[PDB]
Design an enzyme around this catalytic site. Structure first.
Site, PDB file in Angstrom:
ATOM      1  N   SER A  46       8.365   1.785  -9.221  1.00  0.00           N
ATOM      2  CA  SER A  46       8.776   2.914  -8.400  1.00  0.00           C
ATOM      3  C   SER A  46      10.266   3.137  -8.030  1.00  0.00           C
ATOM      4  CB  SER A  46       7.811   2.628  -7.001  1.00  0.00           C
ATOM      5  OG  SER A  46       6.462   2.726  -7.205  1.00  0.00           O
ATOM      6  N   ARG A 226      10.300  -8.599  -0.052  1.00  0.00           N
ATOM      7  CA  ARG A 226      11.428  -7.785  -0.496  1.00  0.00           C
ATOM      8  C   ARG A 226      12.459  -7.286   0.649  1.00  0.00           C
ATOM      9  NH1 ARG A 226       7.921  -3.323  -3.034  1.00  0.00           N
ATOM     10  NH2 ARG A 226       6.932  -3.186  -0.964  1.00  0.00           N
TER      11      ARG A 226
HETATM   12  C1  LIG Z   1      -0.545   2.421 -10.662  1.00  0.00           C
HETATM   13  C2  LIG Z   1       0.575   1.488 -10.744  1.00  0.00           C
HETATM   14  O1  LIG Z   1       1.325   1.674 -11.788  1.00  0.00           O
HETATM   15  N1  LIG Z   1       0.752   1.000  -9.690  1.00  0.00           N
HETATM   16  C3  LIG Z   1       2.067   0.965  -8.716  1.00  0.00           C
HETATM   17  C4  LIG Z   1       2.887   1.773  -9.303  1.00  0.00           C
HETATM   18  C5  LIG Z   1       3.974   2.430  -8.098  1.00  0.00           C
HETATM   19  C6  LIG Z   1       3.706   1.356  -7.105  1.00  0.00           C
HETATM   20  C7  LIG Z   1       2.805   0.659  -6.725  1.00  0.00           C
HETATM   21  C8  LIG Z   1       2.982  -0.071  -5.497  1.00  0.00           C
HETATM   22  C9  LIG Z   1       4.144  -0.072  -4.414  1.00  0.00           C
HETATM   23  C10 LIG Z   1       3.815  -0.836  -3.267  1.00  0.00           C
HETATM   24  C11 LIG Z   1       5.196  -0.764  -2.242  1.00  0.00           C
HETATM   25  O2  LIG Z   1       6.290  -0.247  -2.849  1.00  0.00           O
HETATM   26  O3  LIG Z   1       5.005  -1.422  -1.648  1.00  0.00           O
HETATM   27  C12 LIG Z   1       2.900  -1.434  -2.786  1.00  0.00           C
HETATM   28  C13 LIG Z   1       1.601  -1.359  -3.650  1.00  0.00           C
HETATM   29  C14 LIG Z   1       0.329  -1.992  -3.373  1.00  0.00           C
HETATM   30  C15 LIG Z   1      -0.576  -2.349  -4.318  1.00  0.00           C
HETATM   31  C16 LIG Z   1      -1.739  -3.211  -4.196  1.00  0.00           C
HETATM   32  C17 LIG Z   1      -1.852  -3.450  -2.729  1.00  0.00           C
HETATM   33  C18 LIG Z   1      -2.895  -4.196  -2.244  1.00  0.00           C
HETATM   34  C19 LIG Z   1      -3.229  -4.595  -1.066  1.00  0.00           C
HETATM   35  C20 LIG Z   1      -2.038  -4.338  -0.013  1.00  0.00           C
HETATM   36  N2  LIG Z   1      -1.159  -3.650  -0.236  1.00  0.00           N
HETATM   37  C21 LIG Z   1      -0.869  -3.202  -1.602  1.00  0.00           C
HETATM   38  C22 LIG Z   1       0.198  -2.488  -2.104  1.00  0.00           C
HETATM   39  C23 LIG Z   1       1.680  -0.715  -4.946  1.00  0.00           C
HETATM   40  C24 LIG Z   1       1.932   0.200  -7.653  1.00  0.00           C
END
Ligand SMILES: CC(=O)Nc1cccc(-c2cc(C(=O)O)cc(-c3ccc4cccnc4c3)c2)c1
Ligand SMILES: [Cl-]
Length: 241
Positions: A46, A226
């Site tokens: 991201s 982070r």
């Molecule tokens: C579809 C894909 O490609 N996925 C992806 C793509 C771009 C961004 C993120 C992502 C960013 C963040 C961030 O920047 O903080 C946090 C999460 C995230 C994921 C799972 C969790 C489970 C429990 C609690 N909290 C969670 C938080 C996910 C995931």
């Protein structure tokens, strides 16, 4: 450049490994705990929303920071994603499906040309146009992130000044009487090693400190490290109180 392995304590204490890279803009000096990993290239995840926003804005795919991107009605596992968004909230909540639509409307050809113009990472969009930053061929290092961020800060990227001002507005993360942080988080899980990103900069009254960090992230439970680890380094170097 200078290597400061004392920062390794901030990762070790949390049974983590990673790199913090700092750049002092006034003195044009860089600092890191790990020169090798500072130059190792990872999926941007991201953090790619920075260049993606710039391109979408410059091409008119996004009119401005107020344009509403309506939720497509598909329930996803992140609650904040199941709602309407603009550029500001989409950045804030790292709303992948909004940015996937951006990329589709941008298209392969223009995306490739703009990433080369930005000198962004390995400039390789191999993979699907709507997911290559998550599981495609693009890679970027921490030092390469700072290089790109410095260009954005100075409005020197090959997009309009307006596009760059808007994205820097959308990057706003924290502000108080001592500093302003403009930054973007990232979480790469589709390709090993799973890592977290935090890249951006700290604005002071008479200096700017660019930063780029990544760290091993086997579970989403450690995502808060982070920012926490990064801020501990900033405090240690007396960049923030
Ligand atoms: C579809 C894909 O490609 N996925 C992806 C793509 C771009 C961004 C993120 C992502 C960013 C963040 C961030 O920047 O903080 C946090 C999460 C995230 C994921 C799972 C969790 C489970 C429990 C609690 N909290 C969670 C938080 C996910 C995931
Ligand atoms: Cl602002």
């Amino acid at each position: 450049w200078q290597e400061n392995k004392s920062w390794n304590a901030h990762f070790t204490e949390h049974k983590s490994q990673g790199v913090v890279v700092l750049w002092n803009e006034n003195k044009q000096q860089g600092f890191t705990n790990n020169l090798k990993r500072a130059n190792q290239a990872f999926l941007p995840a991201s953090t790619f929303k920075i260049p993606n926003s710039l391109i979408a804005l410059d091409l008119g795919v996004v009119k401005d920071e107020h344009q509403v991107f309506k939720w497509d009605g598909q329930t996803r596992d992140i609650a904040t994603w199941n709602r309407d968004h603009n550029l500001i909230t989409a950045m804030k909540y790292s709303v992948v499906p909004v940015y996937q639509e951006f990329a589709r409307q941008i298209g392969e050809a223009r995306m490739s040309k703009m990433l080369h113009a930005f000198d962004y990472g390995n400039e390789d969009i191999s993979g699907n146009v709507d997911s290559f930053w998550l599981d495609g061929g693009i890679r970027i290092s921490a030092t390469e992130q700072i290089s790109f961020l410095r260009k954005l800060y100075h409005n020197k990227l090959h997009v309009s000044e307006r596009s760059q001002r808007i994205v820097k507005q959308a990057m706003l993360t924290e502000a108080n009487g001592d500093y302003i942080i403009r930054a973007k988080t990232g979480y790469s899980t589709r390709i090993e090693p799973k890592i977290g990103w935090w890249v951006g900069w700290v604005e002071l009254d008479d200096n700017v400190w660019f930063f780029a960090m990544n760290m091993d992230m086997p579970t989403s439970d450690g995502l808060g490290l982070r920012q926490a680890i990064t801020k501990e380094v900033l405090k240690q170097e007396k960049i923030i109180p």
